[PDB]
Swiss-Prot record, chain B:
Range covered out of full length: 7 to 313 of 379
Family indicated by similarity: Belongs to the FtsZ family.
Function: Essential cell division protein that forms a contractile ring structure (Z ring) at the future cell division site. The regulation of the ring assembly controls the timing and the location of cell division. One of the functions of the FtsZ ring is to recruit other cell division proteins to the septum to produce a new cell wall between the dividing cells.
Protein name: Cell division protein FtsZ
GO MF annotation terms: GTP binding; GTPase activity
Subcellular location as annotated: Cytoplasm
A GO CC term assigned to this protein in UniProt: cytoplasm
Quaternary structure (record): Homodimer. Polymerizes to form a dynamic ring structure in a strictly GTP-dependent manner. Interacts directly with several other division proteins.
Record gene name: ftsZ
Protein keywords: Cell cycle, Cell division, Cytoplasm, GTP-binding, Nucleotide-binding, Septation
Coiled-coil annotated spans: none
Annotated binding of GTP, by residue: G12, G13, G14, V15, N16, G90, T91, G92, E121, R125, D168
Gene Ontology biological-process annotations: division septum assembly; FtsZ-dependent cytokinesis; protein polymerization
Length: 301, 297
C-alpha cells in the first residue's frame, strides 16, 4: 500500500486540510504547517508543525521561506516514508507562498511522487498577492513532479452568484480537496477500473504545471454529464484539448456500471488532444448515492 | 507499586516517535514530549509536554540543562525512563543525554534508544551521530542502538520508502517490545526487578525482531529474531538477553517454551535471560518476537 501524506502549509493550506478531514478524505496522513500556533491547535491534522517562531508571514514570502528552511530537517523527518506527498497552499501569502517549495523540494529529494495543489488568489485580493503568488508558483513548479494550479478567479464563474467572501474561500477549500481526493481515492479506494500507484506515478512524474476540472451529476446520463462539465470546467482555462497528459477519475457508488464509466471515457477521449496520453480510473464511494463525480487533471499543454 | 514507566521523546524526531507510539496505542506508560528548538515546535498529544526551546547538539544540550529543574520534576517517581531523539538529528541529540542523566540521578532505570542513520544519508561533521550515541550511552543504564543499515538485509529488495518506514517501525519496537513485556499480562510474566537487574549499567544493547504465522510460528519467529541483522551477529556473545513473545491468548505453553529453549541455546551459557509473553489478540495467528541483547563474551 502506497503511503500518502497531504501537507497544508500556511493559513489557506491548513484550512484546506481541515476541510479534507471534515469531508472524510481517507487513506492519507494529514500534516499542517503554519507560523501560528493557535490556528494549529484548532486543526484536526494528524501532524502539526509550528514554524518560524523566532520571526513570528506578514504575508512576506521571504519570511515563510526562511521559516520552512529553518525547519527543513524536521519537515524531512515527518515526510520520510511517504511514497506520495501533496503540498497544498493558497498562494499569495507569506507562509504558503514561501514555504511550499521547501516542503516539495524535500519530498522530491526523497523521491516521493510530489504533487502540488495550490490556488492563485482572487484578483480582488490585490496585485501584491497576485505577484507573490506568481513567484511562489514558479518556485513550486521546479520542486513538484506535477503542480496543479487552481485559478480562484474561475471559481466565481461556478457555483452561486450570491456568494459572500467567506463563501468564496470555502469553495477554494473545497476545490483543493477535490484536486487531492480525485487523485488519492484512485489509489486508496479503487472501483472497477483500478489505477494503482505505479500508474499514477507513471503519468504524474515530471509532468510539470497542470490544471484541473471537476464535474458532478445525478440521474439519467449522469456520467456523461459529469464528464462534460469536468472537461469544460472554467478551472481548465479552455485548455483541455491542448493537454497531452490527462488523468481522469470517475467516482460513484456500487451502482455505477462499466457501461456508464466507459461512455464517460469515450466522451473525454473524443474531446482530448489527438495525441493525449489519458489514464481513466474509478473510485468506489457508496456515500455518493446516485451522484457521479468526475475529476480531470490536465498537463503537458 | 507497579513499575512507573515514562517514555520521553526529545526534539523533532523524538516527539514524532512518541506521537507514533500514541497513534499505535502503546499502553501502560506515560508519554513526555520535550521540544528543544526555539524556531519550531512539533505538537504532540503526549500526556506531559515541555518546550525548552529558548539545529545543533550544543544548543539542545544547553536548552535541556537550562530546564533541568523542570525536567527533573516531570521524571520524579519513575521506575523506568526511556529517552529517544528518534530518527534524524538536530537539537534532540544534545538534549537526550541531559534527560537521561537526570532520570538516572533520580534512580530510574534509564534506557536510551538511538538510531544510527543509513550510510546513504551521509554524515554531518564533528562525527555527531556517533558523538550523540556516545553522549547518550554515558548517561543511560542501557542504550539500545538500532543500526538502520542492517534493515536493508531484512525480509525482498528493500525500497527507499520501505527502508524509512521499517526504520520508524523498529524504533517504535525499541520501546514497545520491552514495555509490553513489563506492563501487559501474558501467559509468562516477568518481575520488573529482574529487568532492572539485567539492564542497570549494561551499556550498549541491540535488538532483534521476528514474526511468523502458522504451525511452529513461535519457534520460527524466535529463530528470525535471534538471527536478525539488527543484532549484528552478537547474540552468541550476549550476557544479558530479554525476549518477549507477543501473540494470541491461545498460544500454547509448549510452543512458547520451545522458543524459550531456543534462545537459551543461542545465548552465551553464562547469560542472564529474562523471558516472557504478551497477550495481543489483535495479531490474529501471527506472533511477534523481540530480543534485546546486551553484554559481550
Ligand atoms: N483555501 C483557502 N484559501 C485561503 C483562505 N484564506 C485565504 N486564502 C487564500 O490563500 C492565500 C494565502 O493566504 P494565507 O494562506 O492566509 O497566507 P499564509 O498563512 O501567509 O500563507 C490568500 O491570498 C487567499 O487567496 C482559506 O480559508 N482557504
Ligand atoms: O502540542 C503541543 C503543545 C506544546 O506546548 C508542546 C510543548 C512541547 C512539546 C510538544 C508540544 O506540543
Ligand atoms: O511493526 C512491526 C512489524 C513486524 O514485522 C514486527 C515483527 C516482530 C516484532 C515487532 C514487529 O513490529
Amino acid at each position: 500500500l502506497a503511503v500518502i501524506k497531504v501537507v497544508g502549509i500556511g493559513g489557506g493550506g491548513v484550512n484546506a486540510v481541515n476541510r479534507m478531514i471534515e469531508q472524510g478524505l481517507k487513506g492519507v496522513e494529514f500534516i499542517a504547517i503554519n507560523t501560528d500556533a493557535q490556528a494549529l491547535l484548532m486543526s484536526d491534522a494528524d501532524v502539526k508543525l509550528d514554524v518560524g517562531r523566532d520571526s513570528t508571514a506578514g504575508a512576506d514570502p521571504e519570511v515563510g521561506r526562511k521559516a520552512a528552511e529553518d525547519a527543513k530537517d524536521e519537515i524531512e523527518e515527518l515526510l520520510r516514508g511517504a511514497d506520495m506527498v501533496f503540498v497544498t497552499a493558497g498562494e499569495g501569502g507569506g507562509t504558503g507562498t514561501g514555504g511550499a517549495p521547501v516542503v516539495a523540494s524535500i519530498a522530491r529529494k526523497l523521491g516521493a511522487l510530489t504533487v502540488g495543489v495550490v490556488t492563485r488568489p482572487f484578483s480582488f485580493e490585490g496585485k501584491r498577492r497576485s505577484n507573490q503568488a506568481e513567484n511562489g508558483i514558479a518556485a513550486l513548479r521546479e520542486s513538484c513532479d506535477t503542480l496543479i494550479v487552481i485559478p480562484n478567479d474561475r471559481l466565481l464563474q461556478m457555483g452561486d452568484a450570491a456568494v459572500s467572501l467567506m463563501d468564496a474561500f470555502r469553495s477554494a477549500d473545497e476545490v483543493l480537496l477535490n484536486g487531492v481526493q480525485g487523485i488519492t481515492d484512485l489509489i486508496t479506494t479503487p472501483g472497477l477500473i483500478n489505477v494503482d500507484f505505479a500508474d499514477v506515478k507513471g503519468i504524474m512524474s515530471g509532468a510539470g504545471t497542470a490544471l484541473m476540472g471537476i464535474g458532478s451529476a445525478r440521474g439519467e446520463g449522469r456520467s456523461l454529464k459529469a464528464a462534460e462539465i469536468a472537461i469544460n470546467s472554467p478551472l481548465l482555462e479552455a485548455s483541455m484539448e491542448g493537454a497531452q497528459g490527462v488523468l481522469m477519475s470517475i467516482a460513484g457508488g456500487s451502482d455505477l456500471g462499466l457501461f456508464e464509466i466507459n461512455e464517460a471515457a469515450s466522451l473525454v477521449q473524443d474531446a482530448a488532444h489527438p495525441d493525449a496520453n489519458i489514464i481513466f480510473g474509478t473510485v468506489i464511494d457508496d456515500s455518493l448515492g446516485d451522484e457521479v463525480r468526475v475529476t480531470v487533471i490536465a498537463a503537458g499543454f
